[PDB]
Amino acid sequence: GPQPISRLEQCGINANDVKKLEEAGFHTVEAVAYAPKKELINIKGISEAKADKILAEAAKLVPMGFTTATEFHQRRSEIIQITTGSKELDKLLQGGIETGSITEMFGEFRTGKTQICHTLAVTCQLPIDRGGGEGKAMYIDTEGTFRPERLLAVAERYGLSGSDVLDNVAYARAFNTDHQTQLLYQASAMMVESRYALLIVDSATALYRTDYSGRGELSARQMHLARFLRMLLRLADEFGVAVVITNQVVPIGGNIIAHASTTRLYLRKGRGETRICKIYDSPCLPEAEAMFAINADGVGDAKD
Amino acid sequence: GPQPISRLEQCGINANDVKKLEEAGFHTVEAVAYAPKKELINIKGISEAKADKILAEAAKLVPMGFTTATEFHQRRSEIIQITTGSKELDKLLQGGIETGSITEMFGEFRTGKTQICHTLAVTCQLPIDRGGGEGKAMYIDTEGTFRPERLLAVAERYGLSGSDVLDNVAYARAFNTDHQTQLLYQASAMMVESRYALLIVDSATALYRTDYSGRGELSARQMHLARFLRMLLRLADEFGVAVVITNQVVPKKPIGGNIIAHASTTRLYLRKGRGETRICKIYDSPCLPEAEAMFAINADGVGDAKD
Amino acid sequence: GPQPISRLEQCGINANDVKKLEEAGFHTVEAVAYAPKKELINIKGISEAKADKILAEAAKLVPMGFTTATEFHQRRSEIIQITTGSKELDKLLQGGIETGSITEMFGEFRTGKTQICHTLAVTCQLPIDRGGGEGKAMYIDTEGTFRPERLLAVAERYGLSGSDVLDNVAYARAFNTDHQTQLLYQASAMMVESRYALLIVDSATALYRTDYSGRGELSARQMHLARFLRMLLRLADEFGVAVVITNQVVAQVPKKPIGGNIIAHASTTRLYLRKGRGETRICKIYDSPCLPEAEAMFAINADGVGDAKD
Ligand SMILES: Nc1ncnc2c1ncn2[C@@H]1O[C@H](COP(=O)(O)OP(=O)(O)OP(=O)(O)O)[C@@H](O)[C@H]1O
Ligand SMILES: Nc1ncnc2c1ncn2[C@@H]1O[C@H](COP(=O)(O)OP(=O)(O)OP(=O)(O)O)[C@@H](O)[C@H]1O
Ligand SMILES: [Ca+2]
Ligand SMILES: [Ca+2]
Ligand SMILES: [Ca+2]
Ligand SMILES: [Mg+2]
Numbered sequence: 048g049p050q051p052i053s054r055l056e057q058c059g060i061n062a063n064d065v066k067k068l069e070e071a072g073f074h075t076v077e078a079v080a081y082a083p084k085k086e087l088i089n090i091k092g093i094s095e096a097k098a099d100k101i102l103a104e105a106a107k108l109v110p111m112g113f114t115t116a117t118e119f120h121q122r123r124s125e126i127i128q129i130t131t132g133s134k135e136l137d138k139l140l141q142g143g144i145e146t147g148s149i150t151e152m153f154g155e156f157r158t159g160k161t162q163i164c165h166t167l168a169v170t171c172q173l174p175i176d177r178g179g180g181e182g183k184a185m186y187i188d189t190e191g192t193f194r195p196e197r198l199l200a201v202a203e204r205y206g207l208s209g210s211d212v213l214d215n216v217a218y219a220r221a222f223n224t225d226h227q228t229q230l231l232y233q234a235s236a237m238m239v240e241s242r243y244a245l246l247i248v249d250s251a252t253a254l255y256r257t258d259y260s261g262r263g264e265l266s267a268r269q270m271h272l273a274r275f276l277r278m279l280l281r282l283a284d285e286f287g288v289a290v291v292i293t294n295q296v297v298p299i300g301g302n303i304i305a306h307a308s309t310t311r312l313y314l315r316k317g318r319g320e321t322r323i324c325k326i327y328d329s330p331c332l333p334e335a336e337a338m339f340a341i342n343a344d345g346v347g348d349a350k351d
Numbered sequence: 352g353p354q355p356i357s358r359l360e361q362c363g364i365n366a367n368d369v370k371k372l373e374e375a376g377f378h379t380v381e382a383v384a385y386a387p388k389k390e391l392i393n394i395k396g397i398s399e400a401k402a403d404k405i406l407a408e409a410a411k412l413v414p415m416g417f418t419t420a421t422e423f424h425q426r427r428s429e430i431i432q433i434t435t436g437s438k439e440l441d442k443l444l445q446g447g448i449e450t451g452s453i454t455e456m457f458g459e460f461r462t463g464k465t466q467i468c469h470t471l472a473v474t475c476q477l478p479i480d481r482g483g484g485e486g487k488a489m490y491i492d493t494e495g496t497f498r499p500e501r502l503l504a505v506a507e508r509y510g511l512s513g514s515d516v517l518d519n520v521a522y523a524r525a526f527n528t529d530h531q532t533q534l535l536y537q538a539s540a541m542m543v544e545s546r547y548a549l550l551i552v553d554s555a556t557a558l559y560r561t562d563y564s565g566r567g568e569l570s571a572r573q574m575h576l577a578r579f580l581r582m583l584l585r586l587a588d589e590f591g592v593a594v595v596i597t598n599q600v601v602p603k604k605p606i607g608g609n610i611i612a613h614a615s616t617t618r619l620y621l622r623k624g625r626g627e628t629r630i631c632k633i634y635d636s637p638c639l640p641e642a643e644a645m646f647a648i649n650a651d652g653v654g655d656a657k658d
Numbered sequence: 659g660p661q662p663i664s665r666l667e668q669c670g671i672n673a674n675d676v677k678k679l680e681e682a683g684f685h686t687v688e689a690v691a692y693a694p695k696k697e698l699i700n701i702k703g704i705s706e707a708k709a710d711k712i713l714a715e716a717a718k719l720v721p722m723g724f725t726t727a728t729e730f731h732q733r734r735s736e737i738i739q740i741t742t743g744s745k746e747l748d749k750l751l752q753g754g755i756e757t758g759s760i761t762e763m764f765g766e767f768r769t770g771k772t773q774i775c776h777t778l779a780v781t782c783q784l785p786i787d788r789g790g791g792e793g794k795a796m797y798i799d800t801e802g803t804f805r806p807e808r809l810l811a812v813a814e815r816y817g818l819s820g821s822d823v824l825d826n827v828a829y830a831r832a833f834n835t836d837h838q839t840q841l842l843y844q845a846s847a848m849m850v851e852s853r854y855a856l857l858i859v860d861s862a863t864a865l866y867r868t869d870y871s872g873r874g875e876l877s878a879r880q881m882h883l884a885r886f887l888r889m890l891l892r893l894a895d896e897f898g899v900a901v902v903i904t905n906q907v908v909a910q911v912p913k914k915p916i917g918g919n920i921i922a923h924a925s926t927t928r929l930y931l932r933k934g935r936g937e938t939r940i941c942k943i944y945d946s947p948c949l950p951e952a953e954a955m956f957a958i959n960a961d962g963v964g965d966a967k968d
């Protein structure tokens with residue numbers, strides 16, 4: 048995976064600058080390789096020449112040039128996709144949910160988004176041959192809906208160790224936008240020493256609906272949301288995790304969330320426990336419909 | 352094709368000066384001729400008289416004077432237009448997408464901005480008889496939404512070889528604005544060895560939205576964007592390629608301000624129609640009337656809306 | 659028209675001095691007469707005595723004294739104005755574009771400055787009876803947006819031959835500010851053989867935005883722009899042509915033209931363009947020494963700028 052920031056100390060950078068970068072937020076070399084010189088200058092104890100040297104050393108360690116499309120195709124042919132537990136959804140998504148890209152699921156009030164998030168969180172720890180990724184899951188709730196009993200019930204279906212499953216899912220809650228942003232830095236610091244395969248942010252843009260109800264305060268809300276999405280994309284690129292976010296339709300979030308998201312899914316109520324999932328936006332998937340139901344076990348095919 | 356910069360060696364310029372110019376970023380005689388004196392002076396190993404001699408020698412090889420409109424008309428009546436794969440869009444554009452100028456597309460999400468670029472990256476390799484440009488393609492990515500499977504599908508539709516079209520596409524990923532600008536210098540470096548016909552930037556204004564935050568950073572943001580667009584224009588002029596860029600839409604207005612509106616030559620406004628059909632409208636053009644067209648995104652790329 | 663500089667040889671000036679003047683940039687007696695002594699001294703082969711002798715001889719051939727206002731009124735009553743192709747714009751401008759001065763059009767994108775430039779380039783070749791300048795046109799382009807097909811369409815509208823219209827237009831492309839300034843010397847050199855009636859620069863400020871980037875280069879930018887505008891004024895005074903330039907807008911932190919006070923003070927007439935409905939546009943008088951502040955409406959059709967239909 049990513050190379051730890053300790054490599055720069057060996058490369059020639061003194062330990063004090065490495066500590067300054069670590070306390071700044073950069074942890075895995077590629078974090079400072081992807082950052083502009085302005086961000087490095089913003090650090091209180093780094094000069095322009097020091098920033099230039101650090102950027103050159105970081106660029107010397109990672110490839111940041113041109114390459115053919117054959118190499119990219121070969122690299123992408125081994126991208127890990129995480130299953131959802133439903134055969135129809137797996138067929139619709141052509142394998143499952145891809146890593147390294149942001150996926151957004153949105154719908155009406157209580158249309159089954161949190162159940163999908165729980166199923167993804169429990170299934171991301173499965174072995175690859177069974178459709179998992181062998182990685183710890185991080186769950187960032189902001190509405191207070193995390194129910195561990197659902198995790199126990201769904202893990203009973205696959206027969207995994209419930210205590211081990213609950214030990215492999217980090218949990219956090221945010222009360223305002225600033226804490227939500229700082230949780231991203233905490234996750235970036237935490238992901239260095241452990242293997243994470245799936246990061247979940249629950250229904251987002253909800254705090255921006257209420258905390259930013261003013262008329263002239265809209266621009267700050269939009270800018271903060273854009274920065275949050277950019278940080279999410281940076282994390283997904285850096286650690287190769289499948290960021291799954293959630294949204295709710297009443298619009299105040301705007302087109303920023305739609306542009307930033309790579310794959311979007313639309314969920315609507317059906318008949319009984321059956322619900323409809325429709326691909327809303329994707330660069331490589333056609334529009335289609337799928338039937339899925341949420342039973343007591345979790346998320347699965349609509350059995351009739 | 353452009354003349355390599357080595358032609359200045361036998362005109363009276365020693366090798367080390369040519370090496371300094373090549374390290375600066377110039378790789379053709381046209382690039383040296385078009386550059387102002389200030390750019391040449393700023394090089395550490397170049398003096399006043401040296402710059403004057405270099406400029407005179409470069410101007411001796413490149414025509415930079417007056418002509419008539421008949422000669423320009425004759426020259427322009429043979430430029431290459433790359434078809435978009437849709438007959439209606441080709442009729443709307445009166446031939447296809449024009450080389451040597453900048454074309455900008457903007458609109459909502461799922462409007463087909465990336466699908467058009469994916470189709471063009473394959474169509475630019477067709478023979479001129481079939482409507483291609485007979486050259487390679489270059490792709491610069493910002494959101495990381497490059498999918499070679501679309502290229503394979505389009506190549507299969509047009510009866511080409513998938514491996515051949517894959518080997519003819521150069522791909523790069525930009526993580527910030529500075530890398531985005533450095534990739535242009537690298538592209539200028541690598542555009543002399545082979546022949547390229549199309550250059551794609553997608554997106555062009557995505558990173559500027561979040562890289563510059565404070566209200567005191569607006570001027571620097573706009574100046575950086577202007578420099579980027581000027582570099583794109585320089586590449587298009589000196590290599591005769593077709594530059595296509597993509598914009599976001601924030602009854603709708605694209606982002607970027609007046610700089611990108613003035614710099615762009617042709618602007619296409621894309622909005623979703625019904626089903627898989629989309630509507631393209633000409634938003635700005637020096638020679639094209641304001642009209643509309645219908646097209647669809649099928650399983651093999653952008654094509655006519657079949658019903 | 660102007661008198662060629664070879665006339666000075668009969669007054670007691672050696673041929674080599676005239677050749678030095680010609681290679682310096684002067685091609686008419688008027689250009690030498692208007693020039694200050696510093697410019698003549700700057701030439702390598704000219705001394706102070708030679709400079710003052712040349713200045714006296716040149717001033718002997720042109721009038722540079724006082725006169726009454728009746729004579730100026732009578733002379734100005736015979737000035738030439740070029741129609742814009744739209745009756746509303748001609749009524750607003752009281753005849754059309756005026757020769758001998760600098761006219762500037764500015765506005766955001768899509769407003770139609772380039773269309774007006776193309777229409778004027780075609781129109782300035784009409785006879786004075788029909789509202790033309792009866793001369794050639796010169797087009798200087800800095801953005802690569804020159805389209806001869808628009809010229810052919812506009813010429814077909816007026817029942818002219820397309821081949822002659824295309825033959826009577828000179829086109830140049832500028833790649834930087836230094837080249838943009840250098841093209842004016844060649845323009846002055848080639849304006850003596852034939853008769854020109856219109857000079858178009860489009861646009862005059864596009865390259866200055868990127869050639870000088872930082873705040874430390876603002877003063878040099880403005881001085882270069884001022885020198886370019888002074889050269890344009892000298893050309894307009896020397897050859898009696900109509901100079902039309904275009905400009906871009908910036909957002910006030912609601913749109914104002916770029917260029918600062920130099921281009922605001924230099925320009926004589928300023929036109930403000932903005933979009934109306936459909937293909938129709940609105941033109942407003944921004945600054946003029948003799949025209950009231952008013953508005954007019956025109957449209958961009960398939961055959962160039964014209965009056966809005968219905
Ligand atoms: N194989 C396919 N068959 C049919 N339609 C497809 C296929 N692949 C993608 N699409 C269509 O592509 C559309 C998305 O278009 P595209 O990826 O070009 O968006 P975009 O304009 O780049 O959006 P954004 O603003 O998010 O970048 C989807 O609505 C989907 O219907
Ligand atoms: N043949 C035509 N018929 C109708 N409209 C046309 C035709 N050719 C061009 N147009 C219109 O001309 C407009 C473009 O304006 P143009 O580029 O000439 O001026 P501008 O806005 O001053 O330019 P710039 O983008 O360089 O600042 C578009 O709205 C387009 O619809
Ligand atoms: Ca999207
Ligand atoms: Ca434009
Ligand atoms: Ca004035
Ligand atoms: Mg896209």
Ligand SMILES: [Mg+2]
Binds near residue numbers: 771772803
């Ligand atoms: Mg224009």
